[PDB]
Amino acid sequence: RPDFCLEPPYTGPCEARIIRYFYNAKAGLCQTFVYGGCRAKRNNFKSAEDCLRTCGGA
């Protein structure tokens, strides 16, 4: 799987409170986190399914 899947979630500098998903390699699942709305890193998905299809197993 892509290495970006191993990066911790990135909220960014913007001040929104948008729910997004990131893959948590320690748990083996996608979890939710608050995204600020701009400058998203790649381990940031709009659905748990997209996240698992991209990072599952990393």
Binding site: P13, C14, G36
Partner: protein, 239 residues
């Protein structure tokens, strides 16, 4: 516009609770489940101005007349969004031109707790040091959002002083304020930064971005409404 039926009491991290209904143009942008993700400002009964990075869609709703989001009995207006107008010049990389207009399906019923904020003229000049106010339900500590609407008085900063920290990240459609002991934070985006113009509260900025930890000693950055108001008027006129 700009004149609340309920006068606010002055004197968001390190801000204070607002007098209920004293910022009648403040709206909460929520998803279909009622989850607050951004703030906004009513500019008239059919339009709301917010930030482009909030990514509002027609599935989201505008909630007007709210004070305590933890109150299920509080009377509010859940307004559907008919169309979203994101400024085509919004730069997703630099965050410049961070503004979006929301056209409501059904007009908002203006009242004592629901009314519009005034818009400035493109040539308006709000001097640095001017004490303005920002409001919202964003984090009060960098954690869940506060239930009750918060407010904070803060000064506008000159571009020179702002750039002393942010350097070239500050663009022409941005204005800074803060670094004075208070700070907008996660959940405040899209909300208003207002200053008085001839006694009437006028939208000078839209909460956009800033310190990644909402530091109260760092300049907060807002979309400069004077640089974007012509786009606003043109959009309203054509729709």
């Amino acid at each position: 516009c700009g004149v609340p039926a309920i006068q606010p009491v002055l004197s968001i991290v390190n801000g204070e609770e607002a007098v209920p209904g004293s910022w009648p143009w403040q709206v909460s942008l929520q998803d279909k489940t009622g989850f607050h993700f951004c703030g906004g400002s009513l500019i008239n009964e059919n339009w709301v101005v917010t930030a482009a990075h909030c990514g509002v869609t027609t599935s989201d709703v505008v909630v007007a007349g709210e004070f305590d989001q933890g109150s299920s009995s509080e009377k509010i207006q859940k307004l559907k969004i008919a169309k979203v107008f994101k400024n085509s010049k919004y730069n997703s990389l630099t965050i410049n031109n961070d503004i979006t207009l929301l056209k409501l399906s059904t007009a908002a019923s203006f009242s004592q707790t629901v009314s519009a904020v005034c818009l400035p003229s493109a040539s308006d000049d709000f001097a640095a040091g001017t004490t303005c106010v920002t409001t919202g339900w964003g984090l009060t500590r960098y954690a869940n959002t506060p239930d009750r609407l918060q407010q904070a008085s803060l000064p506008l900063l000159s571009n020179t002083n702002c750039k002393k920290y942010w350097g070239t990240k500050i663009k022409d459609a941005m204005i800074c304020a803060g670094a004075s002991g208070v700070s907008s934070c996660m959940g405040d985006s899209g909300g208003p930064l207002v200053c008085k113009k001839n006694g009437a509260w006028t939208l000078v900025g839209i909460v956009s971005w800033g310190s990644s930890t909402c530091s109260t000693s760092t300049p907060g950055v807002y979309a400069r409404v004077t640089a974007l108001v012509n786009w606003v008027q043109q959009t309203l006129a054509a729709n």
